[PDB]
Design a protein around this ligand. Structure first.
Ligand code: FAD
Ligand code: NAP
Length: 388
């Protein structure tokens, strides 16, 4: 019932979205909010509190040397083991103030000197490479310096920051489902430059959550809702363009549920065009069936697709945007809103760059005018991005 403070909501359904032939995974999850004061609007975000994997917690317990059977008041009582699971960010990289604190408690002079060094101005380049670039966890830094043994209070006050909640762009509309909060969540699983195997904290928890639809002893999590400006226009007559691939599809599923929801009790839809992208029609084409239904009805006018690993061609959403550069510019002159959701470092940037180019050819403006023009779709509120 608060952004800072969560509501114990349960997991009703949890399903894999990829096919058994997919090499990756994407979970569809539904939070049951019946009887909770939680309310949400299309395009809003849901924050989720999660916990650490037990192996990671155990490595911390090894390193810290506490009795897990100690109870204590995190600034009502809790055990060391549960505090590490739910309140300690163990896997991100220690800030410099956290290294300072470890050094204070490092009984090896050389280890204590190295910790203090990495936190000093003199050590900034080294910190950037050995800690940040390599994505070394608090648990690794601590193993590198085993004489650093901070007391329980310091550890939670200065060494480990709290385990932040993870945000997901809600993928359902309240009209279609006012009792369920829908999330679409890619399983994260990387290897750091230093070679640590990292399981995404919240995306692994979601992947393995037990839903009430398969057992009574079901999973639950403290959730909460964050209002966003990623909202549909006032009236359906306004034409809209939705661009996100992969999990960038999430908000638009709510968008299409909302169009349809209004559509049953309302006016004709404006043209809807959705650019989707994924690896293979037979692997990660999440929500395929639902999308064709949205087409059979009037929810979405059209669904361009981009498959980047299936077939000879590496097709991306922006590549499918340039081919359709004529129709979308017409959409702009008709007053269309444009939505971009998904990966922020590559796709959004690439899509942003493509957008600037399309106006030049289909608008006859120079680079500066195009830039100012696009900047002005943003200010007007017609160009929206939900990226991460
Ligand atoms: C507004 C918003 C909406 C979102 N919507 C969605 C959505 O709809 N679907 C979805 O799947 N996700 C979404 N995300 C992203 C999501 O919130 C999480 O970031 C993502 O799921 C990973 O969560 P995780 O806890 O599992 O991974 P984490 O455990 O947080 O890991 C995150 C990344 O950090 C890397 N990492 C590991 N160790 C280190 C280190 N020491 N230093 C630096 N980096 C390290 C990992 O390799 C990994 O790539 C959204 C994010 C935002 C902000
Ligand atoms: N390499 C990266 O830096 C990168 C990019 C995106 C996501 N991720 C990670 O992978 C996980 C799943 O994310 P997701 O499901 O949204 O991503 P995804 O499934 O990897 O991406 C879906 C589609 O987006 C395509 N794509 C990749 N780069 C693109 C670009 N620059 N422009 C346009 N399209 C592009 C992918 O192509 P290909 O995959 O065939 O290249 C794929 O076809 C996330 O946890 C995320 O952190 C990593």
């Amino acid at each position: 019932h608060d952004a800072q403070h969560p509501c114990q909501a349960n997991v009703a359904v949890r399903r894999e979205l990829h096919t058994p032939a997919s090499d990756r995974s994407c979970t569809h999850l539904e939070f049951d909010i019946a009887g909770t004061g939680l309310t949400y609007e299309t395009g809003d975000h849901v924050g989720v509190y999660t916990e650490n994997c037990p192996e990671v917690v155990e490595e911390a317990e090894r390193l810290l040397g506490y009795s897990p059977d100690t109870f204590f008041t995190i600034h009502s009582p809790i055990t060391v083991r549960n505090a590490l699971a739910r309140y300690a960010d163990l896997l991100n990289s220690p800030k410099k103030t956290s290294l300072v604190a470890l050094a204070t408690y490092a009984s090896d002079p050389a280890e204590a000197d190295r910790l203090r060094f990495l936190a000093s101005a003199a050590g900034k380049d080294e910190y950037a490479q050995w800690v940040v670039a390599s994505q070394r966890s608090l648990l690794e830094v601590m193993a590198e310096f085993p004489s650093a043994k901070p007391p329980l209070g310091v550890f939670f006050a200065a060494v480990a920051p709290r385990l932040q909640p993870r945000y997901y762009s809600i993928s359902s509309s309240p009209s279609m489902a006012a009792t369920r909060i829908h999330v679409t969540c890619a399983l994260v699983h990387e290897t750091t430059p230093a070679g640590r195997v990292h399981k995404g904290v919240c995306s692994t928890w979601i992947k393995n959550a037990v839903p009430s639809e398969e057992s009574k002893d079901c999973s639950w999590a403290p959730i909460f809702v964050r209002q966003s400006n990623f909202k549909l226009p006032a009236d359906p007559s306004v034409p809209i363009i939705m661009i996100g691939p992969g999990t960038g599809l999430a908000p638009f599923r709510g968008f299409l549920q909302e169009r349809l929801a209004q559509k049953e009790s309302g006016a004709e839809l404006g043209p809807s065009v959705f650019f989707f992208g994924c690896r293979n029609s037979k692997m990660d084409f999440i929500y395929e069936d639902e999308l064709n239904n949205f087409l059979e009805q009037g929810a979405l006018s059209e669904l361009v697709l981009a498959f980047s690993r299936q077939g000879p061609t590496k097709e991306y959403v922006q590549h499918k945007m340039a081919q359709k550069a004529s129709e979308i510019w017409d959409m702009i002159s008709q007053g269309a809103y444009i939505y971009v959701c998904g990966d922020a470092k590559g796709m959004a940037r690439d899509v942003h760059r493509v957008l600037h180019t399309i106006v030049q050819e289909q608008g006859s403006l120079d680079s500066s005018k195009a830039e100012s023009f696009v900047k002005n779709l943003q200010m007007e509120g017609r160009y929206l991005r939900d990226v991460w």
